[PDB]
Amino acid sequence: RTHSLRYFRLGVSDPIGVPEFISVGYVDSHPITTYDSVTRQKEPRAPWMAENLAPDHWERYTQLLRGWQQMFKVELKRLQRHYNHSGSHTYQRMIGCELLEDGSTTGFLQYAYDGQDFLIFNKDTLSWLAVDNVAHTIKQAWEANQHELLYQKNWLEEECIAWLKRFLEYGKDTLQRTEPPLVRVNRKETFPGVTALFCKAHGFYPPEIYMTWMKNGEEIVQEIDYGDILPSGDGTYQAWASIELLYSCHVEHSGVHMVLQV
C-alpha cells in the first residue's frame, strides 16, 4: 500500500497565543511528532512512536529543532528584507518521501512564503525551481553549495525511506489495518421531476476510497458530485458521490470492489 513520511515547518514573523515556530511530522494522515517554540521540546504525537523510540531520540531532536528554529527565524528575516515586507508573514517547509505499492519511491522538498510556493527541489537534476526573482536569488545561493544538494538527494532517496519503513513497523497495527466501508444508496425526489441518488460510505480505513456511478454498466456522461473524504473522529473515514436523473454505485477500497445496483 502507498505510504509516506513528511516533516512540516511553520515560521511566523511578529505573531499574535500563536507560536513563532512549529514543526510536525506525519506518517500518512497520522501526526507522529511535534515541536514548537513555546514548549521547546520535540514530543511524540502517536503512542506507537512513544513506545518505540527511547528518550535519547527525543533529547537529540529537541536540540536539533532548537537550532533549526533559530535558522528559520533568520531565513524569514532575510526573505522579508528581499521583498521589502513589514509586519507578520509566514514561511513554510515540507520535506518527505513516498513508498509506493509497486516498490518505487518519490522524494520531495519545498518551501512557501505567505502560503504560496516559493522554491521546489528537483532531486533528479539537483536544482531548485524559483517562482519569482527573490526565490531566484535564494536558489543561486543554495545551488552554489553542491555538497548540500547531494546531501538532500541522499536523504530523500535513502534516509527518509529507511525512517518510513521503521515507523511503518512501529505503527503496523494502526497503519497497515483495513476497515472496510459500510455503503448505502439513498433515493429521493428533490425538485419536481428531479431524482437525486446518493452513494454514501463510512467506517473505512485507510481514507483512500474510489466511488463512482455507472449507467447500464457504462461510465456516466452527466456530472457526478463528489463529497470529501472526511475523518469521522474514531480513526475511520466517510465519503459520498451523487447524481441526478438502470444506475449502480461502484466502490473500490483496499483491493475489494463493491456494486450497489438501484
Epitope: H57, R60, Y61, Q63, L64, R66, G67, Q69, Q70, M71, V74, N145, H147, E148, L150, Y151, N154, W155, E158, E159, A162, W163
Partner: antibody, heavy 108, light 112 residues
Framework: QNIDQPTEMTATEGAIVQINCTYQ??????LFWYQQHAGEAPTFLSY??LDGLEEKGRFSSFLSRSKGYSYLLLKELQMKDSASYLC??????????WGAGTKLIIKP | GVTQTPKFQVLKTGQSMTLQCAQD?????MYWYRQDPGMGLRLIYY???????DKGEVPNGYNVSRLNKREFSLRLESAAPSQTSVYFC????????????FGEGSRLTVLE
C-alpha cells in the same frame, strides 16, 4: 556504531597510498576526511555522501554507500603529507562518529 | 577562526579550570572534544545554538556554558588525573553537509 581504519601506514615519497575506512552505522548522512599534523588541530580534507570518486589535486576520496566503505587516496607523496588522517561519519541523528585515525609515515 | 585558551595548563588534583573558546564566523553549533591516544575524538558537550547545550559521549566531570553566539566555555569542577588530555573546541556553520572548524587545542595535565 563503529568506524574502522588502520592505526598506521607507511609508504615511500613520490609513491601512492590508499587509506581505507569502513563504517557500520544505523543511518548515513555523509563521510568526512580530516588531516591532523602532530601537535596541531584537525582540518577538513573532503566530504562524500553519494557514490563516486572526488578528486582535489593530489588527494582523492572515494565512497561506496552499499559497501559502507570509503578511501582517501594520496598520490605523488611528499614528506609534508606525514600526519594523521581522520575518518568521520554522520549517522541517522546527524551526529559525527569519529574514527581513531591513521598515522601516515612517509619513508624518504 | 576559532580561538581556544589556554594552549597548556598544569593543574593540581581538585583544582578548578575553565577552557575558553570563541569564534567570529557566525556559527550556531559549538563542540567540546577530548582527544586521547588510540581513540577517536570524544564529544563531551555541544551547543546546537545559542540558548541550548547538551551532553556528548563523556560529560562526567565537566559542565559548559554557551555564554553568547561567539563563546562556549568548558569547566572542570574538580580536576582529576583522568582529565589529563588534549581538548578541542570546534564550531560549524548553520546546517549542511557542513564541516567543523577546530581551535588549536588545549593540553591539560592533572597532577597529585
Amino acid at each position: 556504531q563503529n568506524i574502522d581504519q588502520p592505526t598506521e601506514m607507511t609508504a615511500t615519497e613520490g609513491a601512492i597510498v590508499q587509506i581505507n575506512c569502513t563504517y557500520q552505522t544505523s543511518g548515513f548522512n555523509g563521510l568526512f576526511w580530516y588531516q591532523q599534523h602532530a601537535g596541531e588541530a584537525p582540518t577538513f580534507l573532503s566530504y562524500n555522501v553519494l557514490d563516486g570518486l572526488e578528486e582535489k589535486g593530489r588527494f582523492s576520496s572515494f565512497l561506496s554507500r552499499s559497501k559502507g566503505y570509503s578511501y582517501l587516496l594520496l598520490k605523488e607523496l611528499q614528506m609534508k603529507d606525514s600526519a594523521s588522517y581522520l575518518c568521520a561519519v554522520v549517522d541517522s541523528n546527524y551526529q559525527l562518529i569519529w574514527g581513531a585515525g591513521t598515522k601516515l609515515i612517509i619513508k624518504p | 577562526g576559532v580561538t581556544q585558551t589556554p594552549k597548556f595548563q598544569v593543574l593540581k588534583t581538585g583544582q578548578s579550570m575553565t577552557l575558553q573558546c570563541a569564534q567570529d564566523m557566525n556559527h550556531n553549533s559549538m563542540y567540546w572534544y577530548r582527544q586521547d591516544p588510540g581513540m577517536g575524538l570524544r564529544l563531551i558537550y555541544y551547543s546546537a545554538s545559542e540558548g541550548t547545550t547538551d551532553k556528548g559521549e563523556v560529560p562526567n566531570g565537566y559542565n559548559v556554558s554557551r555564554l553568547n553566539k561567539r563563546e562556549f566555555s568548558l569547566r572542570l569542577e574538580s580536576a582529576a588525573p583522568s582529565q589529563t588530555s588534549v581538548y578541542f573546541c570546534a564550531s560549524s556553520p548553520p546546517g549542511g553537509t557542513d564541516t567543523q572548524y577546530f581551535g588549536e587545542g588545549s593540553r591539560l595535565t592533572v597532577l597529585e
